[PDB]
Design a binder for this molecule. Structure first.
Ligand code: LI3
Length: 351
């Protein structure tokens, strides 16, 4: 029942994988892992194999590893990354030190789509529809992406889309600093730590992405946190008393009140020539008060998507138990939980 593994050194890294995976070829690497393209001879699929780097070197790392495996095993939706396989060459918990994750080989992301091709309004409709379809699904499980951006959206030749999270980087203060795409899609409340955030942080991101699909340009390309906030407030207007109240931070609240008050702009005069239905949806997503933003489920029933909307084919997720997130365990306990999840993995059906 345990497959045969073979060894191979690729870019100073040892890969021990089941024989089914052939033609391994380095594709990427970072702080959390190294990635190879391969051909899965069992399924006929081109796949990406990610070897996690030092998955159990600290408590934080071990919990992270467990978290990713739990999320990936849970997500089963056409518009979200699916786990094809997970394995370890280890024959026992005692020798368990490496975890490999397998998924469909991406190809293009939305970033190279928007930069390299012309998108009609029909393409924008279809692409955003699919992001929202996936978000309805993850949000139904109380899973928040928090880092939706074009580089995290995979798109095939037929314009079919999946949501993933590549973040092999640790998301430090420095990488959020300056003129960086890493921050341009982030909701203002998380960018500035205004308050406890909710799942409509992801809807803000969708609005930023949709705007960029329509114009071909970044909506809020700030040169730093403050410059970006000024771009935002210029479009959407400065907050009123009602939203200010909700900003828990006192200093953050005092800074906002130092700003000259600005009204919401006319979106038809920003997104010149866009479908009026697209403009209306943008106005409902790019709302400063996260309590008042449209949700994924509400947006799927918006008239902009009339061509694609099918309420019998917009499924929700099975319940996802996240109690582990509030739990403090030792490295070896997180490691043993992870090992159990590796061993118990069951592959999805073929077709
Ligand atoms: O995409 C992810 N992992 C990933 C990336 C590239 C890979 N190559 C081979 C395996 C592999 C795994 C990923 C990880 C997560 F922790 C959460 C989410 N989700 C996505 C859906 O929204 C919630 C966050 C996606």
């Amino acid at each position: 029942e345990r497959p045969t593994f073979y060894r191979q050194e690729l870019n100073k890294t040892i890969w021990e994988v089941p024989e089914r995976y052939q033609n391994l070829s380095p594709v990427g690497s970072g702080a959390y892992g190294s990635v190879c393209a391969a051909f899965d001879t069992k399924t006929g699929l081109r796949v990406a194999v990610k070897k996690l780097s030092r998955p159990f070197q600290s408590i934080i790392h071990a919990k992270r590893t467990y978290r990713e495996l739990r999320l990936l095993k849970h997500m089963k939706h056409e518009n979200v990354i699916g786990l094809l396989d997970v394995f370890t060459p280890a024959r026992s918990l005692e020798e368990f030190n490496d975890v490999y994750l397998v998924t469909h080989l991406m190809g293009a992301d939305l970033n190279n789509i928007v930069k390299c091709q012309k998108l009609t309004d029909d393409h924008v409709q279809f692409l955003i529809y699919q992001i929202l379809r996936g978000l309805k699904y993850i949000h139904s499980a109380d899973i928040i992406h928090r880092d939706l951006k074009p580089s995290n959206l995979a798109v095939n030749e037929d314009c079919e889309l999946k949501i993933l999270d590549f973040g092999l980087a640790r998301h430090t203060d420095d990488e959020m600093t300056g003129y960086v795409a890493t921050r341009w899609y982030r909701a203002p409340e998380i960018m500035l730590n205004w308050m406890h955030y909710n799942q409509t942080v992801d809807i803000w991101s969708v609005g930023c992405i949709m705007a960029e699909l329509l114009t071909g340009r970044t909506l809020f390309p700030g040169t730093d946190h403050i410059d970006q906030l000024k771009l935002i407030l210029r479009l959407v207007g400065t907050p009123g008393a009602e939203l200010l109240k909700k900003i828990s931070s006192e200093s953050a609240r005092n800074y906002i009140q130092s700003l000259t008050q600005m009204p919401k702009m006319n979106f038809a005069n920003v997104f010149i020539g866009a479908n009026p239905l697209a403009v209306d949806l943008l106005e409902k997503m790019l709302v400063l008060d996260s309590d008042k933003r449209i949700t994924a489920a509400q947006a799927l029933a918006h008239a902009y998507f009339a061509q694609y909307h099918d309420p019998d084919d917009e499924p929700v997720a099975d319940p996802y138990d996240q109690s582990f997130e509030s739990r403090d365990l030792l490295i070896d306990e997180w490691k043993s939980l992870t090992y159990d999840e590796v061993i118990s993995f069951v592959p999805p059906p073929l077709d």
